[PDB]
Design a protein around this nucleic acid. Structure first.
Lengths: 129, 361, 149, 83
RNA sequence: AAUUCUUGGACCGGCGCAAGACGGACCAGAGCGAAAGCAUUUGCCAAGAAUGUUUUCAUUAAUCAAGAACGAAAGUCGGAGGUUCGAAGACGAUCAGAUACCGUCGUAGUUCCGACCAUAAACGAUGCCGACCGGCGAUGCGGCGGCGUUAUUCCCAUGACCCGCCGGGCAGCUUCCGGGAAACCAAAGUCUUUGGGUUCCGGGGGGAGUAUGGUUGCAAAGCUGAAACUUAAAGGAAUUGA
């Protein structure tokens, strides 16, 4: 069955980006996917996207810019304490220059650099570089 | 065989395979026939056959999957019999028998919405039968004897729209539908039917009570037409007073005086109204308007006939009386017209009408 | 895919976007509720009632015309059956299979299909027990299953 | 092809696609006013009926249920209705 | 070739009768089934996937220690049956030898009913559930739209073809999707740019599926299952030779 919805959504973007498609329709829309994609947009890896309401779980059409090497998920949602965010961002990300670990904290869904600044640990969602 | 509990639950699983694709169609009437012939007890065979008897003759119109085709001489015959066994049991037991409480069973059909329009389900069989017969006449070679062999059934159809006419336990006000179906089998009837029972000099030839009961049906129009005039002009719908009065006008013609008839034509104002009406009535108008001048011709008025029968014969479409004519323009609509074509025997003759526009002029 | 089969059928109803009621429909909320009562009184399950309504009368959903769902309407007026009409049909099916299997003891396929049906009864029965629409005593056992209609 | 508007597909694409796999799913069925020639009245019938719909007081059978769409009786004017 | 059968008429032709097996060709890279498996006609009994749906319930779901149902063939016990074929047997040939291949007979068995057995190269040597990622032409079942041909002559309406579309299914051809040691694979892809969920299970070759205990069985045997000792290789795909 469909256990993880964010996992499906990020595999769909990743497959479409490799194949060189210009936009992709990720199906089962959720608050966690939208809040993930806003962060991904604010750093400028995706374009503007449009979420499509049928009276169910919505759909999303993401306009893709060819500047996304990988967007992955970590399952299960491990409880990243603040000091251990180094060893996570060490072994997940390409270099210390670019790439982001997005993790769901007390405040909201935000990347490792913001969570480090705000002084908050939380549960890991995924990574994008 | 038991307490009407094994005949209301075997009449609730053989009128359940009705219409379905694995219908059988033919040997379903047999299982509706083998719930009356193995029904040989009171209220289990000799009381409540009525509810079965509605769905034994309703099972005979469904034998034909199409509604553009006609019942075969075999099927047509047995359904003129089974409509009469209905009337053998609904005459000599004056009451309602798809409800209206008497004791308990097997009547009392209240739980079923209205035990009144399932009761009014006899007028809609004799109305369905009245229309079913017209197809028997529309599909025969009219210059063949097989037309006459079928018109011998017209003494048997006129009988049941009379046997289920006298029956006044309607449930005037709501009976007028069977009145129009009756007058429709009297409006085109001739002199020697309507005259030569009045014209046999009323002395010791026709002055006994039931010897003067063949004298009922000359002016049945007087009684039943006004009832389809001033109850229906009080009531909801329109159709059964527009049609009712033109049958009256056409029957105050060809065996009665002009002055009596022409008044009715101008009373109802169908000279400048029958424009938004439906074609099935819009021809009955043309049929009437043609007979007007034909009977004006009969008495002597040989220029009153002329100036009335101009706009009909003027056209190449002088078949607004009869079976329609020639060339194409939407074939699917011309199949909606072969189901309109009025019956052969009723038709005003055309070599007789052209011989009143070159004999009046 | 299917619970007790290798099939992957994609074939169900697809409701329209618009939850609104159509203009042509002259039946009101209470008129539909009055007919829902009469159909159920005659002896008919919420599945059949919804079918008979939208075939003959023209009622896409009772939920859109009225406020509530068909069983929810029935069990307010108090016409609803005691055990649900899906667990009823599974039990009646298990009775018909088991009766056929009583005479045909060499039917090894009927034996296997009885295990799948009775497994599906057990599976659905406990869902209803947690939601508390069955008394926690409730036990489907084949000997006293034929008596449950 | 890389560039396809998945937001604005032309309506021949959506009518082609399976009813569940359109951009927003919608039923392939409809309602239609069907009347037999004899009576005056129009009764609502669902496209994929699956019951034998009768004209009032058992006048005659109106539609026959099949695998997909229902066979309407020969000699019946049907007007599919829209909202 | 011989063993064997036959003037007590074999083999061959004809007409009958009885028995017990099996369902040819049609029969396909077709269908159904959880797998093993399943084919003459008709009837009865219960089940089932797929399609169709503007019906219903509303998270009831996915995979699974324990426990449980079915499980080709051979094998075992009791009953009925024994036409064909046929382990062991008995001979006839072949050969240096032949306890074999070839031949003539032929017992258990091969078939049915009721009880055990539980393994097969039980194979796609490829767990099940879910998502995404190319193209093309067929094929089986269901639905939908469409020139026209044809059967009911009376054609509405049904079947048989014809041209597309949608959903499941057995497959096919094609390609720098991509993967791989290669062979090859739209999955064996989406993997150092490594995490969707979950059960079983492998750790150089032998000893060894062996000993020992325990457990199931009437028995054969099944399931669980080591160690001492021995050894530098055994092996998988592909290339050039012979």
């Amino acid at each position: 069955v469909r256990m993880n919805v964010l996992a499906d959504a990020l595999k769909s973007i990743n497959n479409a980006e490799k194949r060189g498609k210009r936009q992709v329709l990720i199906r089962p829309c959720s608050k966690v996917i939208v809040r993930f994609l806003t962060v991904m947009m604010k750093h400028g890896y995706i374009g503007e996207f449009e979420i499509i309401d049928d009276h169910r779980a919505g759909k999303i059409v993401v306009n893709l810019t060819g500047r996304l090497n990988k967007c992955g998920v970590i399952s299960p949602r491990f409880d990243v304490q603040l000091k251990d965010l180094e060893k996570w961002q060490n072994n997940l990300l390409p270099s210390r220059q670019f790439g982001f670990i997005v993790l769901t904290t007390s405040a909201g869904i935000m990347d490792h650099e913001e969570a480090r600044r705000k002084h908050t640990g939380g549960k890991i969602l995924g990574f994008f570089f | 065989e038991i307490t009407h509990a094994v005949v209301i639950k075997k009449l609730n699983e053989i009128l359940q395979a009705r219409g379905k694709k694995g219908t059988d169609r033919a040997a379903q009437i047999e299982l509706l026939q083998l719930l009356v012939q193995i029904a040989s007890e009171n209220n289990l065979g000799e009381g409540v056959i009525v509810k079965i008897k509605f769905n034994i003759i309703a099972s005979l119109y469904d034998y034909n999957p199409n509604l553009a085709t006609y019942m075969k001489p075999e099927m047509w015959q047995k359904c003129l019999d089974c409509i009469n066994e209905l009337m053998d049991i609904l005459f000599a037991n004056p009451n309602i028998f798809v409800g209206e409480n008497i004791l308990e069973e097997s009547e009392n059909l209240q739980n079923v919405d209205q035990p009144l329009r399932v009761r009014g389900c006899i007028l809609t069989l004799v109305e369905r039968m009245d229309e079913e017969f017209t197809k028997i006449m529309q599909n025969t070679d009219p210059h063949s004897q097989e037309y006459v062999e079928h018109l011998k059934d017209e003494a048997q159809v006129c009988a049941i729209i009379e046997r289920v006419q006298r029956y006044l336990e309607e449930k005037t006000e709501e009976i007028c539908r069977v009145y129009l179906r009756r007058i429709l089998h009297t409006y085109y009837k001739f002199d020697y039917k309507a005259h030569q029972r009045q014209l046999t000099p009323p002395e010791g030839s026709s002055k006994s009570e039931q010897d003067q009961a063949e004298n009922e049906g000359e002016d049945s129009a007087v009684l039943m037409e006004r009832l389809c005039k001033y109850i229906y002009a009080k009531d909801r719908t329109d159709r059964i007073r527009t049609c009712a009065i033109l049958c009256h006008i056409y029957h105050h013609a060809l065996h009665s005086r002009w002055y009596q008839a022409r008044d009715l034509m101008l009373m109802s104002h169908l000279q400048d109204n029958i424009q938004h009406a439906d074609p099935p009535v819009q021809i009955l108008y043309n049929r009437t308007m043609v007979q007007l001048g034909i009977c004006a011709f009969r008495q002597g008025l040989t220029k009153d006939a002329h100036n009335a029968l101009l706009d009909i014969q003027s056209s190449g479409r002088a078949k607004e009386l009869l079976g329609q004519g020639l060339l194409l323009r939407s074939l699917q609509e011309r199949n909606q017209e072969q189901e309109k074509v009025e019956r052969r025997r009723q038709e005003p003759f055309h070599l007789h009408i052209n011989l009143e526009l070159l004999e009046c002029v | 895919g299917r619970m007790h089969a290798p099939g992957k059928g994609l074939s169900q109803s697809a409701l329209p976007y618009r939850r609104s009621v159509p203009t042509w429909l002259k039946l009101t909320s209470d008129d539909v509720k009055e007919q829902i009562y009469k159909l159920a009184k005659k002896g008919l399950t919420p599945s059949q009632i919804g079918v008979i309504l939208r075939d003959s009368h023209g009622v896409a959903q009772v939920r859109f015309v009225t406020g509530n769902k068909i069983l929810r309407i029935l069990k307010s007026k108090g016409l609803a059956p005691d055990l649900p009409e899906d667990l009823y049909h599974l039990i009646k099916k298990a009775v018909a299979v088991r009766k056929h299997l009583e005479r045909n003891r060499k039917d090894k396929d009927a034996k296997f299909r009885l295990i799948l049906i009775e497994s599906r009864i057990h599976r659905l029965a406990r869902y209803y027990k947690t939601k508390r629409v069955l008394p926690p005593n409730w036990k489907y056992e084949s000997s006293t299953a034929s008596a449950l209609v | 092809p890389l560039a396809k508007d998945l937001l604005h597909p032309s309506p021949e694409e959506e009518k082609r696609k399976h009813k569940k796999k359109r951009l927003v799913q919608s039923p392939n069925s409809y309602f239609m006013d069907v009347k037999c020639p004899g009576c005056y009245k129009i009764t609502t019938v669902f496209s994929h009926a699956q019951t034998v719909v009768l004209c009032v007081g058992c006048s005659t059978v109106l539609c026959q249920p099949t695998g997909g769409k229902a066979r309407l009786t020969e000699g019946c004017s049907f007007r599919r209705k829209q909202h």
